Homo-oligomer: A and B are copies of this chain.
Amino acid sequence: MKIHPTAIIDPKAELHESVEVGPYSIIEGNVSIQEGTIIEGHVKICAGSEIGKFNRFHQGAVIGVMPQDLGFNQQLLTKTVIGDHNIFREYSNIHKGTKEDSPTVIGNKNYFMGNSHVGHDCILGNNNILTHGAVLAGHVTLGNFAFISGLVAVHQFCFVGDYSMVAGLAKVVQDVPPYSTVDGNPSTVVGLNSVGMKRAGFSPEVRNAIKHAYKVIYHSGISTRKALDELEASGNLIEQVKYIIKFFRDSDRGVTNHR
């Protein structure tokens, strides 16, 4: 495949022969890019970038740029780890990590819309969608199949659970629980993300069991600590409900207030 004449690629960058690089794009040293990845014009791939297979980088996307962190030492060799089949739209912005053993990690099949931003040391699983203009602070963690709507800001050190929805313009300051929808400023858990669960093809029995868990947690007139104890003492739970309980117990900032 074809690399454009005007593209500036460091001799040490390692690119599979199938990789395409468009006009006026800049690829630095200490970069690896695997099979079938396409890079369009004015794209910047910074030192430390490890890029998987069949990714796309649309015009002006910047990958592995310096952390927006005043205390970060810019002489450090830090990394951005990107999996397979990811789409980075125009002027999307991905920051590298802040320590050697602490990269920014993106899994597979994620979609980063135009102008979207991933801060230093974020960790992101698979099949997530970052909508236009949305910003993740440093150290934000996404699971799999999370949907972040347009112009959302997510506070540092928050966790976004599997199959969750964050609505347009929501200000997220605490965790987004799995299978749930969060909305507003101040943001609240509005309810279940039934749209995400149905599209995923969760059985009605699994959907009802997730419903039951959150009924106990949020709709039974009892504290969250008592609620989680109640669910464990109820019997053999499905993996999804086990996951809800763990997500609540392991929370660093706490879970977003329910509406």
Contact = CB atoms under 8 A, between A and B. Distances in A.
A53 interface: no
Interface in A48-92: 58-60, 62, 65-66, 68, 70, 89-91
A153 interface: yes
A141 interface: no
B60 A60 contact: yes
A184 B186 contact: yes
The quantity of this chain's copies bound in the complex is 3
A167 B137 CA distance: 13
A155 B8 CA distance: 39
A233 to B, nearest CB: 39
B111 A93 contact: no
Given A59-B62, A168-B155, A117 B133 contact: yes
Chain A, interface residues (CB within 8 Å), range = 35 or more
A96 interface: no
A171 interface: yes
Interface in A182-217: 184-186
Contacts of A89: 65, 68
Nearest to A41: B26
15 contacts: A8-B23, A26-B41, A42-B42, A42-B60, A59-B65, A68-B114, A90-B93, A91-B93, A93-B115, A132-B135, A135-B151, A151-B153, A153-B168, A155-B168, A168-B173
